[PDB]
Amino acid sequence: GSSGSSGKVKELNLHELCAVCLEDFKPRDELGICPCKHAFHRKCLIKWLEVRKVCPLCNMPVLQLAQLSGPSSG
Ligand SMILES: [Zn+2]
Numbered sequence: 001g002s003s004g005s006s007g008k009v010k011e012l013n014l015h016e017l018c019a020v021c022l023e024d025f026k027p028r029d030e031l032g033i034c035p036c037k038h039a040f041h042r043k044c045l046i047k048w049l050e051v052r053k054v055c056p057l058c059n060m061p062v063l064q065l066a067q068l069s070g071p072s073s074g
């Protein structure tokens, strides 16, 4: 964990924080958006998907993309 509130900190407050790692999302790292209106770290997701092929937020089974994006289905 983190403990040591000290020094001047200037980090715009937001209402969006990862669920797997629980760390303020950063632009430097790519963000993957899910069909459940939930975004996560390209790493957090990929990994979390291995141990649990579900969303750590809504907890919905995301195996196949229902939406008709491309003929890459079959
Ligand atoms: Zn994360």
Ligand SMILES: [Zn+2]
Pocket (backbone or CB within 6 Å): 034, 036, 037, 038, 055, 056, 057, 058, 059, 060
């Ligand atoms: Zn979700």
